[PDB]
Amino acid sequence: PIRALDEGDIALLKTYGQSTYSRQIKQVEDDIQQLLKKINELTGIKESDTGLAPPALWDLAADKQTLQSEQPLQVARCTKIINADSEDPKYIINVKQFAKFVVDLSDQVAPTDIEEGMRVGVDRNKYQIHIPLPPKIDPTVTMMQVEEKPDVTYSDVGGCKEQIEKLREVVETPLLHPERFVNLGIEPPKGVLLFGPPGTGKTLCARAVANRTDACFIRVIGSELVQKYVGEGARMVRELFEMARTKKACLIFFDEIDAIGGARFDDGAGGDNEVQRTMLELINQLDGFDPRGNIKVLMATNRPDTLDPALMRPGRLDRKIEFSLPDLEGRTHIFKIHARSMSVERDIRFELLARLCPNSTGAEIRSVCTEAGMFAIRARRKIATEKDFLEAVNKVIKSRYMTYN
């Protein structure tokens, strides 16, 4: 009992209930769309900045720099000088990803400054050496290091006194005052694992460490250590620890190390043994058949129960520190720190607010202060009041206890 629209039904519904302007509107909209397409087509495509310098800094005749000094020397690592056979050196080279070769020098004005593994330059057709090069630096690991100190001090970390003291001891006192440790005959811990509920001042304490320390600080991107090409992650961690050893006093800061390696149980993880392998290399570097030098490690993690026991062992992570939820004094101090810069009344009870926010983290308290300011803004008021802070607490901490009176 439901007819189907015929030719006439459709030819009348498109022509009977109809505005006398509908056709013109439709045509004009289609024209606008087509014109937009055509305009985008004509002016489309910008000029992708290619890196050209401003004119008058260039130097033509560089076609001669391209025809002379032409040799686009490949880089090779002399892995064996074949004993030099006294005369007739007959060096060996290890052009990576390409081949091994037996070659000689060519116009090498210092045939003695060749060594083994010196990263020589080698021509394309005849593989004679032309010029040595300095050792590889691995730009990824090179930029892993922190250069600009973050603007966080040991005064914006409120509610963490014992943890700050332990971290300061382990990470700074062996660096700035070795006299006490050598006097007492105690080798201070070399390795700290900061663990606690998400958001308690772990990375904030790491930032404060980075700001205070006068020593190499290496923030390790947990994603940069995982790659394709099995063995690449292990190679990167090896080179990272090599550079750390090169530096006089180094402070590595593996953040969210739960990414790089938990338990080693593979079972169905046959495809995830590469991460376990790089974690094993990290373990070896942290403590193995070799002194580690003046390298101190920081390791931040919310969940230090998925981690490998071989990594959590107190020969690699020696001073495990827990960032617990701050007590009432800590919460009051965090409120004071975070509301120092806020435009607030002069009689707000931050002790009361710390009481109102139990089992709350420093990030939670920061959010409370921000929402108090936001409530003040949402009323055209310049000074956030105790009422606004209480509203912010109610909105952030919680979002009936009539049995607990």
Ligand X SMILES: Nc1ncnc2c1ncn2[C@@H]1O[C@H](COP(=O)(O)OP(=O)(O)OP(=O)(O)O)[C@@H](O)[C@H]1O
Q: How far is the CB of 330 from ligand X (least distance, A)?
A: 7
Q: Which residues pair with 37 in a beta bridge?
A: none
The footprint of other proteins on residues 109-138 (CB under 8 A) is 116-117, 121, 131, 133-134, 136-137
Q: Is 256 among the residues that bind other proteins (CB under 8 A)?
A: yes
Q: Which of 86, 341, 403, 405 binds other proteins (CB under 8 A)?
A: 341
Q: Please, are residues 308 and 263 in contact by the beta-carbon 8 Å criterion? A: yes
Q: Is 334 among the residues that bind ligand X (CB under 6 A)?
A: yes
Pick the piece of the chain touching ligand X (CB under 6 A) from 71-79, 131-139, 357-365, 391-399.
Answer: 357-365
In angstroms, the Cα distances linking 325 to 55, 85, 161, 199, 286 are: 61, 70, 12, 9, 30
Q: Is 227 among the residues that bind Mg ion (CB under 5 A)?
A: no
Q: Please, are residues 144 and 221 in contact by the beta-carbon 8 Å criterion? A: yes
Q: How far is it, in rounded angstroms, from Cα 321 to Cα 224?
A: 26
Minimum CB distance to ligand X smaller for 15 or for 341: 341
Q: Which of 93, 120, 170, 200 binds ligand X (CB under 6 A)?
A: 200
Helix (H) or strand (E) holding 131: strand 129-132
Q: How far is the CB of 227 from other proteins (least distance, A)?
A: 4
Q: How far is the CB of 253 from other proteins (least distance, A)?
A: 7
Q: Please, are residues 348 and 189 in contact by the beta-carbon 8 Å criterion? A: no
Q: Is 13 among the residues that bind other proteins (CB under 8 A)?
A: yes
The footprint of Mg ion on residues 193-222 (CB under 5 A) is 203
Helix (H) or strand (E) holding 343: none
Residue in this structure with the two tokens 């435009």, named with its chain if needed: 343
Angle between helices 328-339 and 362-377 (to 10 degrees): 40
Q: How many residues bind ligand X (CB under 6 A)?
A: 22
- List the beta strands (DSSP E) in 291-379: 295-301, 321-322
Q: Is 302 among the residues that bind Mg ion (CB under 5 A)?
A: no
46: DSSP letter: -
**In sequence order, which residues have a C-beta less than 8 Å from that of residue 359 and are 6 or more positions away?**
325
Q: Is 11 among the residues that bind other proteins (CB under 8 A)?
A: no
Q: Which of 76, 103, 158, 392 binds ligand X (CB under 6 A)?
A: 158
Q: Is 185 among the residues that bind other proteins (CB under 8 A)?
A: no
Q: Which of 245, 352, 374, 385 binds other proteins (CB under 8 A)?
A: 374
Q: Is 3 among the residues that bind other proteins (CB under 8 A)?
A: yes
Q: Is 262 among the residues that bind ligand X (CB under 6 A)?
A: no
